Design a binder for these strands. Structure first.
Ligand SMILES: [Cl-]
Ligand SMILES: [Mg+2]
Ligand code: NA
Ligand code: NA
Ligand code: NA
Length: 309
DNA sequence: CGGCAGTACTG
DNA sequence: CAGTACC
DNA sequence: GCCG
């Protein structure tokens, strides 16, 4: 990254727009930050700034300002509210609208939130685990969590396949949470297992809090036994076997890689979701493998580690 | 001008 | 429904 | 914010 002196200050702007709710501008800043953290060179011209995909006139100009004096005028005019809004929206279950409302109501610290805010069930759990959920775990811990879920699943039906996705599958040394995808090659036995699986995992003390318990996805909180353990975010998603390849791809990510794939799909008159690759309500195309998705998009296969965009 | 993804939960 | 979350 |  020959441009960490540009990206460091752009990231302040990106975050300010993100937590203030301007999600599209925040998207544009993040793309430009990704582009600039990947070029071949330092950028030292406005005509070179425009050179790169994701950098336009206004973003060029901002490069051409750090160009000169080593800072961006715009940074000194970010609302004093941004760090508080960032604090509040780092509570799981609170996003930008809730953070702006708390701010408007005069809350300024997590002590204010604890003592005076009305919290949803999810947000009270997010607040209780505030620090823990900002921490990444070693991937060796994601492994133990995956194999905990697998053992409980395969106990009830040994045909069940369980796979940790997310940053774990992309090979990262640390993970923000664990995403366990479950399916069954028989095409039917995947259904209705959550009752049994989740109560099994509660039986250990392993599952400590539920955030979401739907018919096909569970989002919650777990903790391995013993000393020195922290609470970890855990998602479990159950999918029909015919959808396994698209689910693997979607839940392996990264989010920027998926977004680049949806856009490439759109150039070919197709659509790509966690459930399927389809034509324009079109037809679902058969994708038994991740490799088939790439092939039908006319792309060469990328292993999970080269999707970490 | 307007897309930049679609859906599953929660309440 | 609006809001939040998943990659 | 960028881009078509
Ligand atoms: Cl596959
Ligand atoms: Mg994850
Ligand atoms: Na949040
Ligand atoms: Na008060
Ligand atoms: Na997750």
């Amino acid at each position: 990254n020959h441009n960490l002196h540009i990206t460091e200050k752009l990231e302040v702007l990106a975050k300010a727009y993100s937590v203030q709710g301007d999600k599209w501008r925040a998207l544009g800043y993040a793309k430009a930050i990704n582009a600039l953290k990947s070029f071949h060179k330092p950028v030292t011209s406005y005509q070179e700034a425009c050179s790169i995909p994701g950098i336009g006139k206004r973003m060029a100009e901002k490069i051409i300002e750090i160009l000169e004096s080593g800072h961006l005028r715009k940074l000194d005019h970010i609302s004093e509210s941004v760090p508080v809004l960032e604090l509040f929206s780092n509570i799981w279950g609170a996003g930008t609208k809730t953070a702006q409302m708390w701010y408007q109501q005069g809350f300024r610290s997590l002590e204010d939130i604890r003592s005076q805010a009305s919290l949803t069930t999810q947000q009270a759990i997010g607040l209780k685990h505030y620090s823990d959920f900002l921490e990444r775990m070693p991937r060796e811990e994601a492994t133990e969590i995956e194999q905990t879920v697998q053992k409980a699943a395969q106990a009830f039906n040994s045909g069940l396949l369980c796979v940790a996705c997310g940053s774990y599958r992309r090979g990262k040394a640390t993970c923000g949470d664990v995403d366990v995808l479950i399916t069954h090659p028989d095409g039917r036995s995947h259904r209705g297992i959550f009752s049994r699986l989740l109560d099994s995992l509660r039986q250990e003390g392993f599952l400590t809090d539920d955030l979401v318990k739907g018919e096909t996805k569970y989002l919650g909180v777990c903790r391995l036994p013993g000393p020195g353990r922290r609470h970890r975010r855990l998602d479990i998603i159950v999918v029909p076997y015919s959808e396994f390849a698209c689910a693997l791809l979607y839940f392996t990510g990264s989010a920027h890689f998926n977004r680049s794939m949806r856009a490439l799909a759109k150039t070919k008159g197709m659509s790509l979701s966690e459930h399927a690759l389809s034509t324009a309500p079109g037809r679902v195309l058969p994708t038994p493998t991740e490799k088939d998705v790439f092939r039908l998009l006319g792309l060469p296969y990328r292993e999970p580690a080269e999707r970490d965009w």
